[PDB]
Design a protein around this ligand. Structure first.
Ligand SMILES: Nc1ncnc2c1ncn2[C@@H]1O[C@H](COP(=O)(O)OP(=O)(O)O)[C@@H](O)[C@H]1O
Ligand SMILES: [Mg+2]
Lengths: 161, 156, 54, 120, 272, 47
């Protein structure tokens, strides 16, 4: 926390997304709502989000950290679905920014104990790897389209292990 | 009530003889503490809500008596007896304006006298040894102690 | 000559030490007076607060 | 914003070379860092008005306190506050109302600090 | 602390111990070389001092100009080498100034300058750095003597303080007097020496100054290398004791963490 | 349990800060020297 994940991802949106022909998607998963509003207004100012015409180049999905775990565990899938559609039917390049994709895991962990599952190594659900794989495996560049996925991943207490 | 004459401090510190700095610094510090205290105290004593208060007491007569005694009775105020240092000011006028000024000005007068005397002298290419003896009494060769030629101690 | 001129210049402003002393004495008396005022005020309010608390 | 920025840079540089305690440049860098450090100390239940904080930090960061010892900085801070709160209430009101250190305000601040430093 | 704090501390101390062992080995090699080079310089310097102790020269008791030279190095981590020398220098300088003299100081090595830069900061005639990087040579002593003579502080008496190397484990701080030719000329023991005007004697004094400085350099470097070897050995030993204690603590903490996580899992499993 | 390179400054204990300062002071000195040389070269190359 406090190292530059959000600033770096905003910088990437500033560079790549602004000068990118294809569409773009931003799924804010379990992050501060202040930042969601700041991004909305910065995008409106830059022009990627146009409130007047139909020339907007970014679709936003928000599941911020005031939501109950059920919504945080699924807003990533909602953003991923929007990106998947733009990949397949539109048959075009897509960007997909997620911030953070650790809140998906964490939100999955906040309900596992109440669903009757014994916990795993460190208070995590037994299905951590499978639950994360069944999501990260739809964010891919198939032969029908191409998703460039940038993910911010919180590392609790700087512990990379 | 209060209007304190302003001060310059770097100026103030120029006027303390070395034998008197030990009291000057203490006076500075005491001024500092007192000024901080005065700033601490408020501009006015806060008011009193006599009506409400006497409305919230049983023996309204007793509180009325205290209120009236407060109104009639006032507080004293100190005097300038501790300001006897008034006297000192006049004494200073003597050194500053009468004594030190006067002898200082006379010493000036003499220093001028000497300066214009030393500035109006013939070009040295025209002068004579008697002239050096008189303008500079340092070039005189005392015969009272070296009567014989050269009147110098040759080891010189 | 210049040394004497500077000394004379300082003579003019010699009076600041007395000025400081006067300011100090006056404002010290003022401080004591204000302390007396506030002390009577505080004691009387505590005095009467006794009765209301009772 | 104007003053705390330079203060932030000065403390950031100071914290790097702090673990020890030669040359004039780095010696003065440590001196300035320490002066600012003792400037930031404070008591309890005595918060300061923003303009007063600006005055103190400006005095400290503009090389004025670099002459003083670092054990006396608290004495300065306190006395300077007491002096300004009475003699120069107008300047503090100006800084609060206009919300910036204008050029005239900066020149005043400069002369007040220069006078007070020597007179202390 | 927590397990990560202990792990980081343990790794750091292990690195420190490795480094100190390597430095002890390096210092030991340099010490062996320094002793080897010190034997001949020992005979040479003792010979150069021969004259003054054979023709007993008493310094005049009517002169105020004195010189203090203190030989050390730039390198640290040598224990109480620079400390002893600086302590004795300030002792002697205080004594001289209490006797009403006009002392100066030459510092051969930074650490001497630093130790004496708070007090005696103004008596530094000149100081020399870059000592200790390579073994001192006669070139260094010649340069020091040359810059002492060139800098026109004609001294009336002298002293040099260096750490005489006794043994691989011990050293002593000495004070070898230095005389100016004013004292050699007016010494009755010197009336026996033949073919001696006041010019050959001046060249002889300059050479003897270079000789004594070189002797002190060799003794000081030998003692310093010995002290650095000893200091590094002791530091490595202390790091080893600290590593043992921290390894015990780390093992306790690792087991405690395993037990804590396992009990959390068990409680969660049984609390369904 | 092993040790790795650059661990003294990873712990951040006393040795870490001591090393950081021992580096920073030296390189501030060298930067000052190099800046002086750069100014001298600037002046000497105007003509
Ligand atoms: N490029 C940058 N330049 C300067 N400061 C930065 C930069 N990126 C981040 N920061 C600092 O990090 C803070 C923001 O961190 P942020 O990236 O929002 O947190 P996180 O990465 O934990 O989401 C800011 O207050 C700022 O001081
Ligand atoms: Mg963030």
């Amino acid at each position: 926390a406090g190292v530059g994940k959000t600033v770096l991802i905003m910088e990437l949106i500033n560079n790549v997304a602004k000068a990118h022909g294809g569409y773009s998607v931003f799924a804010g998963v379990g992050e501060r709502t202040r930042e969601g509003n700041d991004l909305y207004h910065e995008m409106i100012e830059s022009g990627v989000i146009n409130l007047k015409d139909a020339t907007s180049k970014v679709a936003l999905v928000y599941g911020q950290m005031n939501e109950p775990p059920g919504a945080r565990a699924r807003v990533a899938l909602t953003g991923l679905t929007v990106a998947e559609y733009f990949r397949d039917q539109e048959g075009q390049d897509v960007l997909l920014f997620i911030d953070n994709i650790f809140r998906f895991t964490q939100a999955g962990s906040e309900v596992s104990a109440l669903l009757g599952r014994i916990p795993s190594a460190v208070g995590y659900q037994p299905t951590l790897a499978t639950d994360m794989g069944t999501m990260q495996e739809r964010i891919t560049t198939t032969k029908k389209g191409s998703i460039t996925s940038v993910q911010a991943i919180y590392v609790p207490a700087d512990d990379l292990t | 009530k209060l209007a304190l004459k302003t001060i310059d401090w770097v100026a103030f510190g120029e006027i303390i003889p070395r034998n008197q700095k030990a009291v000057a610094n203490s006076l500075k510090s005491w001024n500092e503490t007192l000024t901080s205290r005065l700033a601490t105290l408020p501009e006015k004593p806060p008011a009193i809500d006599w009506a409400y208060y006497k409305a919230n007491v049983a023996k309204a007569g007793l509180v009325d008596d205290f209120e009236k005694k407060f109104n009639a009775l006032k507080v004293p105020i100190p005097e300038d007896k501790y300001t006897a240092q008034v006297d000192a000011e006049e004494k200073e006028d003597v050194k500053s304006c009468a004594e030190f000024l006067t002898q200082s000005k006379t010493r000036i007068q003499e220093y001028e006298k000497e300066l214009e005397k030393m500035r109006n002298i013939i070009p040295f290419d025209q002068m004579t040894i008697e002239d050096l003896n008189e303008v500079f009494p340092e070039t005189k060769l005392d015969k009272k102690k070296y009567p014989y030629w050269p009147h110098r101690p040759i080891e010189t | 000559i210049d040394m004497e001129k500077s000394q004379q210049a300082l003579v003019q402003k010699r009076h600041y030490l007395f000025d400081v002393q006067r300011n100090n004495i006056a404002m010290a008396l003022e401080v004591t007076y204000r302390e007396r005022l506030h002390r009577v005020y505080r004691e009387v309010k505590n005095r009467l607060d006794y009765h209301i608390s009772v | 914003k104007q003053v705390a920025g330079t203060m932030k840079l000065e403390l950031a540089q100071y914290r790097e070379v702090a673990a020890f305690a030669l040359d004039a440049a780095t010696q003065q860098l440590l001196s300035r860092g320490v002066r600012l450090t003792e400037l930031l100390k404070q008591g309890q239940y005595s918060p300061m008005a923003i303009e007063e904080q600006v005055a103190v930090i400006y005095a400290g960061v503009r090389g004025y306190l670099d002459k003083l010892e670092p054990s006396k900085i608290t004495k300065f801070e306190n006395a300077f506050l007491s002096h300004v709160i009475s003699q120069h209430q107008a300047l503090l009101s100006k800084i609060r109302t206009d919300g910036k250190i204008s050029e005239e305000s900066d020149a005043k601040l400069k002369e007040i600090v220069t006078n007070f430093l020597a007179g202390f | 602390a927590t397990l990560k704090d202990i792990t980081r501390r343990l790794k750091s101390i292990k690195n420190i111990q490795k480094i100190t062992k390597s430095m002890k080995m390096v210092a030991a090699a340099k010490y062996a070389r320094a002793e080897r080079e010190l034997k001949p310089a020992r005979v040479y310097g003792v010979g150069s001092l021969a004259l003054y102790e054979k023709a007993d020269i008493k310094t005049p008791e009517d002169k105020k100009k004195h010189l203090i030279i203190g030989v050390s190095s730039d390198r640290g981590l040598c224990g109480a080498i620079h400390s002893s020398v600086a302590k004795q220098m300030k002792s002697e300088a205080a004594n001289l100034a209490a006797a009403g003299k006009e002392v100066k100081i030459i510092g051969v090595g930074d650490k001497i300058r630093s130790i004496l830069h708070r007090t005696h900061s103004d008596q530094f005639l000149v100081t020399f750095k870059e000592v200790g990087r390579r073994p001192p040579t006669f070139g260094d002593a010649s340069v020091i003597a040359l810059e002492l003579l060139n800098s026109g502080y004609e001294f009336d008496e002298g002293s040099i303080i260096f750490n005489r190397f006794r043994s691989v484990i011990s050293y002593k701080t000495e004070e070898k007097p230095i005389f100016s030719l004013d004292t050699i000329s007016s010494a009755e023991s010197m009336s026996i020496y033949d073919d001696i005007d006041a010019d050959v004697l001046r060249n002889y004094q300059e050479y003897s100054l270079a000789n004594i400085i070189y002797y002190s350099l060799k003794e000081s470097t030998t003692s310093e290398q010995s002290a650095r070897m000893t200091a590094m050995d002791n530091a490595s030993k202390n790091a080893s004791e600290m590593i043992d204690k921290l390894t015990l603590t780390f093992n306790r903490t690792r087991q405690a963490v395993i037990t804590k996580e396992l009990i959390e899992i068990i409680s969660g499993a049984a609390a369904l | 349990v092993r040790s790795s390179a650059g661990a003294v400054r990873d712990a951040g204990g006393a040795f870490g800060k001591r090393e950081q300062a021992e580096e920073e002071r030296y390189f501030r000195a060298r930067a000052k020297e190099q800046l002086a040389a750069l100014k001298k070269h600037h002046e000497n190359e105007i003509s």
